[PDB]
Amino acid sequence: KLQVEQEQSLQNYMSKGDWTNAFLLAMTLDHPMRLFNVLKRALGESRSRQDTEEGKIEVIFNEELDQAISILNDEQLILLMKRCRDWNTNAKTHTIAQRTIRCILMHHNIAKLSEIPGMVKIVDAIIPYTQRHFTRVDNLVEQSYILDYAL
């Protein structure tokens, strides 16, 4: 309706601002490609500095999303998880789809709190592509030292 389209205009604007309520507001809305763009920009650069939960820290505070996943319900988790299933297929995108996983495994209990929808197909679907991309970085890691080792 009206507040939906105006809410899409706020979703257009908030991307110029921060990432947190743009992430939750874009999570409750269409479309997940722009949601992939904000995770692309916020998650995209190389950084391994001070304490995060999903690699979200910058000069501007992105650890509020470190809070925002702990409050999130399971419907957005499975609706997120089918998108991670959409993002683990092609190369170089799966890593972005990795970033929430190490997040969500920290936040919720082993039950994936008790009212859990059927997701056996997805949790069965993630793993062989993770083992697939795992051997690649195994190769580049064992090939990285050898240029140093010569001289």
Place this chain on the structure above:
Amino acid sequence: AAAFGVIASNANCVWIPASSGNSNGSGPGQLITSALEDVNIWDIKTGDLVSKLSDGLPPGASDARGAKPAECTYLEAHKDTDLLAVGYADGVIKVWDLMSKTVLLNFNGHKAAITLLQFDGTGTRLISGSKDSNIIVWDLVGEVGLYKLRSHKDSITGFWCQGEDWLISTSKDGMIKLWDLKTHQCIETHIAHTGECWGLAVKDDLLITTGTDSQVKIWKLDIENDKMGGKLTEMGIFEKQSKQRGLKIEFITNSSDKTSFFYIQYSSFILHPFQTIRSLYKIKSASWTTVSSSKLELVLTTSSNTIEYYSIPYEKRDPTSPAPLKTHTIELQGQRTDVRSIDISDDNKLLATASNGSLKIWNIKTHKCIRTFECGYALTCKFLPGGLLVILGTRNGELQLFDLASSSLLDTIEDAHDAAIWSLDLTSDGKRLVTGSADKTVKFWDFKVENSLVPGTKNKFLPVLKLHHDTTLELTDDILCVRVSPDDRYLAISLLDNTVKVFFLDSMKFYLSLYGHKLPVLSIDISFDSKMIITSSADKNIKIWGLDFGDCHKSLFAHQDSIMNVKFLPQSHNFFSCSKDAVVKYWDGEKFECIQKLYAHQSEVWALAVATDGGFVVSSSHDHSIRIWEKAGERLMEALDLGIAEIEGLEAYNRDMVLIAVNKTPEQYIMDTLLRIRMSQLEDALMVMPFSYVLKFLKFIDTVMQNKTLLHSHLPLICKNLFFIIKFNHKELVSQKNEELKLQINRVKTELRSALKSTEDDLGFNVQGLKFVKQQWN
């Protein structure tokens, strides 16, 4: 052969009626210029033809105009009255000189015609929204790369502030979009409509909107988290336009409910007595409203092919409304409406066109007098040969006798008809009249002066010719066109059984029927050689006939719309076609091919006749006027030489006292060539490069690893190229001396192995974290 007509824009045309107003612009204050099918110049309080800009001979140009046909969308003058600017029914905007009527520039880039066009308060910008659903900003240079704002699906209505920044928009897709000027982004879209925004006006501080929803929404200027203060519901029908007073103490609103009403304590209510008026609002729904520049009147633009003047009840202005004044037309829009029939005299100085309520007398472009008895439009008109009297056929079945001198009817010709008159033409001397009627008979009529017991001035009806009961499946008894033999030997008749029948002057004997017509016929004519004929039908097919039957000479078929009239030449050498699709075509009467295709017609042509002089063209129309006629790796070397040429220059910037590769850092171009290159055969471009390419190359890897950037590249690309160059050459076959880049590699590889080791540890916890709950969920 030789034929008349020209390819020019003007041949002494009177084709512009100066009608159908939709907008206007105020000029000198005592004058006002009007959007019509031209640019017209009127007085603001008298209504006389001050000037008129149309087609013609501009100073220093040929095939140029002052204004076009195909109705003007908007028309306004510049605030310094130096520039003229009109957007037309085509996408091209034309600016014109104010003193002369030469053209200055031509503005295109528009897929559709102009739906918005106005000067800005600076004058150096002209804004034009068109019906291709976007906005185009214009500079005096012609800068269109400034701003092209489009997130729409329909046309736009509302616009500018007066502060060079901070624009607003309301559009016809039910949307009201908010944009900033610096780097435009839709912060917010206020929507309260479901249809089309018809008109728009800001008062001074309150922006009201008028749409299909028959309501009024007020809006505040300094707006965020939408400012709403009220709505004025239900004028009675959807509102169309509004206008503020130049003193900004009132606000007039107009609609298609034949009413206009203003607001005053302005206010959110109408609080002034309105029974003082004497010149009630309008007979036809109006297009646009402007206050007059004399601060005493109101200027109204209606859809009755004319615009008018009134006033608004107030003590400063005139407390009543005056009678509307109209300009000095040439008696082409001084009377009412369209022309369906024309007729020709034999002196080339008496040419009459008829309307719903007028008969207009013309020599070439000068109008003598009017004759008014019309109970409709005329399907046919016919002069007397000699031009003494004229005979009219209205849409009542009534033939009317008019004198040449005055407007008065001498004699009403006997209404023995019960249906309207399709066809009518007189003979050579003009004493026999053959008519079009569905009364299943042919009516002959006498004609002479009034000096006996048989009225020739009232055409007493002695002979009866009736055999019309021929049976068919299309329609038995109706006639469309009648033609008199030029030798005065026979009569040709159009019939609704897809035939024509030929019969001589006396009692019925049969000559010829022509048939083969999929559609019924529109018009039939005879050559003055009197051997071959033509016929026009409703199947877009024009058929030539001589004396045979069933042996088709030629199916003259190249058309798309219906055919109004096709006629021969008055010396029988050129037959011509006027149709529905607004194009008139010359055709050689001896050949099958066309000599000239005249396309300068925008509106519908209903009829067209050429006099026996043959030097001019008379044309009936729907705009009621007459158009008178007569490799990659060397680019990588350039990239590295440019990039190290930047880095070495930035090193000794002030520690010791090119516009494009592309970026704020040139190294982003270095990765971009790695992005642009194909995944195959890149090693052929890499293997060419020497050892100095490596020494220039690793500085960019240290640049991106100290830059911590993985947005524009990825580590298998960098390690992929690294592993290629360590295959190629070399570390100790390129250098035996301990150097700075050699020690740079020893820390860069540590940065790489840690940067990949992070993500590898992330997955190494991720998948084992996924396994464990799947062990439990069983």
